[PDB]
From a paper:
Estrogen receptor alpha (ERα) is a ligand-dependent master transcriptional regulator and key driver of breast cancer pathology. Hormone binding favors LBD head-to-head homodimerization, helix 12 (H12) binding over the hormone-binding pocket, and exposure of the activating function-2 (AF-2) cleft where transcriptional coregulators bind via LXXLL motifs. SERMs and SERDs are comprised of a heterocyclic core that mimics hormone binding and a side-arm that disfavors the H12 agonist conformation. Rather, H12 packs into the AF-2 cleft via an LXXML motif to sterically preclude transcriptional coregulator binding.
We solved x-ray co-crystal structures to reveal how the T6Is bound in the ERα hormone binding pocket and to understand the structural basis of differential efficacy. In these structures, the T6Is are well ordered in the ligand binding pocket and form canonical ERα LBD antagonist conformations with H12 packed in the AF-2 cleft. Hydrogen bonds are formed between the T6I core, E353, R394, and a water molecule while the side arm forms a hydrogen bond with D351 to favor an antagonistic H12 conformation that is docked into the AF2-cleft. Interestingly, the F425 in H8 is rotated away from the ligand pocket in the T6I structures compared to laso and RAD1901. We synthesized 14 T6I analogs, based on existing SERMs and SERDs, to determine whether side-arm composition improved transcriptional inhibition. Those with increased bulkiness including methylpyrrolidine, benzyl, and azepans enhanced anti-transcriptional activities. Whereas, less bulky side arms (i.e. methylamine), showed markedly reduced anti-transcriptional potency.
Numbering used by the authors:
A (entry chain B): 306 to 330, 341 to 414, 420 to 461, 465 to 549
B (entry chain A): 308 to 461, 465 to 531, 534 to 550
Amino acid sequence: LALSLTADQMVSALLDAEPPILYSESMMGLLTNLADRELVHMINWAKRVPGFVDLTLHDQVHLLESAWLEILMIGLVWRSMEHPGKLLFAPNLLLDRNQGMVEIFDMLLATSSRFRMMNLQGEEFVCLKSIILLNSGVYTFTLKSLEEKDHIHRVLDKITDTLIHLMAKAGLTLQQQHQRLAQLLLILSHIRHMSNKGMEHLYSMKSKNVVPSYDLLLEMLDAHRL
Amino acid sequence: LSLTADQMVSALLDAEPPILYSEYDPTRPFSEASMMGLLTNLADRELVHMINWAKRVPGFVDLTLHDQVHLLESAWLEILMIGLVWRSMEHPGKLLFAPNLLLDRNQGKSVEGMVEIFDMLLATSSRFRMMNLQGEEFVCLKSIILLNSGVYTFTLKSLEEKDHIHRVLDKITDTLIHLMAKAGLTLQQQHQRLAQLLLILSHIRHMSNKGMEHLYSMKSKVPSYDLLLEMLDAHRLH
Ligand SMILES: CNCCOc1ccc([C@@H]2c3ccc(O)cc3CC3(CC3)N2C(=O)c2ccccc2)cc1
Ligand SMILES: CNCCOc1ccc([C@@H]2c3ccc(O)cc3CC3(CC3)N2C(=O)c2ccccc2)cc1
């Protein structure tokens, strides 16, 4: 029944689901602590993305495993759009590139500058986040699994429809619509690249719970009791 | 920037590199021990053609040589992989590295970390199959990889280059949409398919980063920036 929402309904649901902005509480201890607290809010947000909770819990966890760092990154880029040259990790934690860290830092700044140049809108941003959640694990998962992937692709199609709808209501021509859609989805591959480097770094720590476990994510999802 | 969509597709089709073979060296028969050497030599020969292909992607040679090399340094493995996936599309469960080098997953299990990447490639091939990806779409996607993968990791000249690259990417988008419009897809089907194709590029980037990790774990003597520049920096004496 999530696949029966109108585009306007999809947008409203996604705007209403947005997580709060957290505050920060060693720069790296601070950033780890912030990320760890944001994760919980991200899960609550994921559960409100239309179509997401129709998946099995097992598949919801896999999608969160694959997507969470990309989702933290795109949130950071969004918060940082109005702060050229700086990254707004939290309202009390604005860092510039002077504060292997600088490479990712510079890439995030470039992404934030690209969003600024494009005049990325909030309604577009929340569609892009939902695409990351559904797309980032869809290629790295039986009859049941195939049905799940099929559902994922149907939801992704509806989000594409919603993005085009937003662009059309903003007065873009059909050409500008498809050009903008393409520009936004190409940025997602850069966001994937940044996440890949950060995940490589986390795994290299060989430290039990630095990468959120399946069990931790599952606990956060707070499964029904029946 | 002046080309029509039809002329863009024709240029990209005309620029396509050939399908290369693995060596037929009777002194070097295929085995698990020789496999990496055969695959490295194949990749090395493909890279030479890839350089000459890139120079034929409309808009690419308008860039500085320095920026051309950066784009190739950032894209070459993705381009090698998407070509592999394309060659494998019609062979479920196999990777067609060359017509005489068709491997299955159990042959992948020879090396550490190789089967994981192998399965990601197979999944991409399966997705191409499900979408019934067309050759004209494939050549558009490969050019997008070339222009997009390095554009976010690059002065007034740099601003002009990035503007140019974004204009060329926009023309390839127009070209992809035109291919689907000519075929008869509805507008809704056109936007849905464009998005489906472009989302696959995130997966290809992911695979490229895993593959880079794997190649570096080989501890052999990856094309360097200096090496790619030597290859792209052609003279005009021919
Ligand atoms: C999950 N438990 C284990 C910790 O994983 C962590 C996850 C994220 C981060 C932060 C963080 C925090 C909040 C945010 O909203 C976004 C980010 C982004 C990020 C990865 C880019 N990061 C950094 O520090 C960073 C690194 C190098 C260059 C610039 C920034 C820290 C640790
Ligand atoms: C570039 N200079 C030095 C060469 O580095 C090389 C570049 C490419 C490869 C092959 C190769 C060859 C041709 C092709 O078209 C594609 C590929 C794909 C690939 C990169 C993923 N590869 C592997 O073996 C591999 C590994 C794990 C899983 C599956 C495949 C070997 C070495």
